[PDB]
Each structure stands twice: as structure tokens, then as C-alpha cells.
Symmetry: C3
Subunit: 274 residues, 3 copies
């Protein structure tokens, strides 16, 4: 390489060396009563890897710094500890293969681990992970004690309107296929037989079901209505609406009403509890 | 240090200075009709901090770029504004101490803030945060107006099968200890007394409870069944099942049924609403 | 990498405008494997995934707050009590 050397009357020194093969620069200094320092190389992308979310491959492609496989014979928690010990990275992305012990979820997942201090002997941090079905899981570590993973449920608004309980045999569309859901909420809006304090509106009431594959899901219940007096107790009534689901459609199958007022199905929400 | 100085016949200048203490290089230039520039230091990892999720400490360890403490006497919203004003970071990680005013949650938490433009006078952005219990919270800022924090609920499937209401005194396992949950969903699958439009299946119906510590949680209600005619209204019936929980187990305590057909408990889901 | 999506974009994580993080380990768009986490203008959370360039349906998370707790008797009719947040911040 080319060496540029400087030396003073007190034996302070500076050496800059540029490699004749690669064109990389290296620098070193010496004090009057000291040795030279080790050669400081010029800066390169790979010197940032401890602070990035991604590892830098030899082709300059970007990947996860942590990959955890069932062949490693390690838990997710020990893979995090080993990764923090090997790299000193505090915030980083990860992949975990399905079936890894202590994994955020049973399926394969990808996620982000976040912490402010790489102390594996008293680790403090959090993670957020997403599965091959789009499920969300979150969790934390506190003094190297690990909390149980918190799986989120999820939902979609499938249908909204006002379908009368008397409109039996009517079919309507859904915003998604019902087979994408394990649970459903059916919302019903009612007027009671008598008025209570001058109102007969009940609000809009949820019925939640597991999608067992039944030819009818049955919303049924009771109202108490009318104001209590010393001579008259409040009256009681019963109601039903039956509904069914098929692909991106739903049907009002049947109903029962014990008064002359119109009763409605008004919202349908698809639910997953993975 | 060592100064390498260059100066042309027109008074263009280049000064390269290397510090005799640290071995860091500094460069300055002057034009014929100008002054010297400020000293441009050599490149270092700290010069990237505006674009990273992590800060870089003096020992070269990673940490969060935002740490918020109750001693700071600031809201979380003001700590975000101060951080964006101090650093120009649009996407970054954070820690918030429990009891910080306007915090995503009451306990201590760790999270990610995301935005595309560091404009604190009309801030547009979002956050995701995780607590010391593993709870998840999300929120937004829109024209520097801040929305209320959205805490997500979480769940686990504790048991599934088909246990008859008549099987009173029977006990079964749960996939986790019930004391890990504040709420429970108990699912019941029923056949009605009469058929309606040729079906008596109700689907599988949710009963949701807060885990107040009761010795029985009482799933009870009604069905309407049969087909209406001008001479015969649909009939009515009542039902009950009582359940209890003890560590990693549950028991079918009692039941009532007003028809001869089998009624079942079929799912138990543990729920947290933190 | 991070992303912004405008409200009304086809196939968006949500109908409103949103901001989020996409995560993957290999840039193969002919067999793309990865996940996303997104947040809306109201603070809603949505997650989803891509697997062999097949796209999964977006999973919107619900949310809650404890507004009130105690033991108000059914006989205390006409009594008004406070909530920890405004009810207009909730749909259910």
C-alpha cells in the first residue's frame, strides 16, 4: 500500500496506510512514550449490524439477525438470550419455526423484540409476533423472568342494515367468506310489548356463537316490560330469530315474536379466537 | 495533532488534522473568496442514530432513543414531541415508566412509534406498546391531536369437547390455570323442545363472565320453539348449567332442562381485558 | 421496512389511512414470505401475512377500556355515575 507517515521532534506519530489491492484506508497513531495504536480501518455497512433491525449478508442482501429452528434444540427464550450474548443487539427482528419450545405461537412466526439494555443476567424487554395466518401475539421479560404470551382475538364487520324478523327466507351478502371465521356475533334491535318509563327501545343486543356448522344459529331470550305498581307487576315476553351462513352470504331462517311491533337483525361480525 | 495543509496560488485550501489523543481525522476547506468550513469529522456509527430504532451508547451498546420517567414531570405526548424536536427521528423505540401522565398504560411499558415526517407542529403518526404483564396497546396522533389508547383483549382456549348437562359432578382439565384470567366464555350447545322449520339445533351459544370468585358461574336463559299458527303460538322453555373452576380444572356443578333432549357444555375460553 | 397507506387504497390493511411495519428475511417477490403490523388514524391495530406470495386476510384486533366498577343496586333507579372515558369513544 501507500503509507503517509508523520513524525514530530517529540516522537508523536501518525501513519495512514491505503491498501493497494482494495483501496481501503487504515490509520494508526503513536504517543512520545507509547506504542502505535492498532490499525483503525475505514467505515463499512457491516460495522452498523449491532444497531440495525437486519443482518447484512455477503451479497449485501438484508435478513433477520435471529433465525430459530426446531433443529437448534433450544427454546425461544434461550435463543433470545444466546442472540443478545453473541451480538449485544437490544432491538431486533426474528423468525421462529413452528413447534419451537416456548415460541410465541404453535405455527411459524415473524416478529420484533425490543429492549434498552443487553443484560442477559437480568433481561428487561418485550416482543410482538405475527403468524402464517396473520394472528397477533405479544409478551414481556422482566429481570429474566418471562411472562406468558398474550394472543389477540380478531374481527371483521361482515354485514349491517335492518332486516325484519318477519322477512324469513331472505338472503344477504357478507363482506368476507364465513369459512374465514371460527366465531360470529349477530346483533338484534327490539321494541318491547309495554313501554318502560315511556320508552320501548331495548338498544341493540349481541348474540355470540361458535361456528359449529349448524343449519341454524338461534338468537333467543326474554324481555320484562311495563312499569311496576302496587297493583300491576311488569309483563314478560319471549323472542327468537334463527340465522344461517354459507360462503359470503347469510339467511334469516325463522323467527318468533310475542307482540305486534317490528323486530330487526342489524349487524353481523365475524370473529377469530386463534 | 498532525496537520496536513494544502494551499494553492489562488488561496483554495485543504486542511486535514488528525487528533494525537484519539486518532480521529478532521477535514476543513477554504475557497479563494471564502473562509474555512467547520471541521468535518470522519464517519462514526453515532452519525446514523437519526435513522435507527436504537441509540448508540459511549461503550458502543444499543439502547432505546426515548426513555420517559415520572421524575421528568412530562406527559408521554410531550416526551414524543421533545424527542422528535431534539433528534428528527420519525420511527423509534421507547420505554415509559408506570404512572407517567398520558402513558399508553398504567404499568411500565416498551414500544415502537412510527411516522413519515418529523413535523411536531402538525404531527401524524402511530404507536404500539407492550406492558410488564404482556398487555398490548395501540394509538395515534393526527395533526398533533392525540387519540385515546386502544388496549387489546387477549385469550386462550382452556377446554373443548361435549359434556352433557346431566353429567353433574364431572371434572375436566384446563390447558392453563384459571387464575391467569379475569374473564371466561362458556359455550353451550342446545336442542329445543319443538322443531322450528324442521330443525331443533340452536348452534353453540356464548355465556361470558367476570371471574369474581363465585363457587358457581350460572349459564341460564330461554328458548322459543315450534312454528307459529293462528291457533298455536310457539312454546317457551328455560335452561341452566352451573360451572366452577379450580386451578387447571373445571367442574360441571349442576343443571336444569325442561325437555328430554341432551344439552352440552362444549367450549371454555379464558379471557383477559387488562 | 415501514409503510404508509392512504384510506380507500384497494387491499389495504384497513379502510382508513394507516401506518405500519413489514417484516421478512428474504426479498423473493416470486415466493414472498413475511408479515405486517399496521395502526389506523383512530389507533386500531391490524396484522397480516404473506406466504409463498399468497396473501392472508387482515386480522383487525378489537379493543376495550374499563369505564366503571362497583356495586350499584337495581333498586337505585335514576342514579347517575361517572365513566373513566367519554362513551362516544366506543362503538360497543
Amino acid at each position: 500500500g501507500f503509507l503517509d507517515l508523520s513524525v514530530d521532534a517529540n516522537d508523536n506519530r501518525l501513519a495512514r496506510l491505503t491498501d493497494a489491492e482494495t483501496g481501503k484506508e487504515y490509520t494508526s497513531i503513536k504517543k512520545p512514550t507509547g506504542t502505535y495504536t492498532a490499525w483503525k480501518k475505514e467505515f463499512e455497512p457491516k460495522d452498523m449490524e449491532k444497531y440495525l433491525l437486519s443482518s447484512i449478508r455477503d451479497d449485501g442482501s438484508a435478513s433477520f439477525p435471529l433465525l430459530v429452528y426446531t433443529s437448534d434444540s433450544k427454546t425461544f427464550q434461550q435463543a433470545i438470550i444466546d442472540h443478545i450474548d453473541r451480538t449485544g443487539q437490544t432491538t431486533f427482528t426474528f423468525y421462529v419455526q413452528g413447534g419451537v419450545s416456548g415460541s410465541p405461537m404453535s405455527n411459524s412466526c415473524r416478529g420484533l423484540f425490543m429492549s434498552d439494555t443487553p443484560n442477559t443476567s437480568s433481561l428487561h424487554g418485550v416482543y410482538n409476533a405475527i403468524g402464517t395466518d396473520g394472528r397477533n401475539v405479544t409478551g414481556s421479560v422482566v429481570g429474566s423472568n418471562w411472562t406468558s404470551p398474550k394472543t389477540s382475538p380478531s374481527h371483521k364487520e361482515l354485514w349491517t342494515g335492518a332486516q325484519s324478523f318477519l322477512s324469513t327466507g331472505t338472503t344477504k351478502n357478507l363482506s368476507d367468506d364465513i369459512s374465514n371465521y371460527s366465531y360470529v356475533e349477530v346483533y338484534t334491535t327490539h321494541k318491547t310489548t309495554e313501554k318502560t318509563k315511556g320508552n320501548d327501545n331495548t338498544g341493540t343486543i349481541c348474540h355470540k356463537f361458535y361456528l359449529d356448522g349448524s343449519g341454524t344459529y338461534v338468537c333467543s331470550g326474554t324481555f320484562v316490560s311495563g312499569d311496576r305498581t302496587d297493583t300491576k307487576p311488569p309483563i314478560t315476553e319471549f323472542y327468537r330469530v334463527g340465522v344461517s351462513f354459507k360462503g359470503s352470504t347469510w339467511t334469516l331462517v325463522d323467527s318468533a315474536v310475542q307482540n305486534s311491533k317490528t323486530q330487526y337483525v342489524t349487524r353481523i361480525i365475524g370473529i377469530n379466537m386463534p
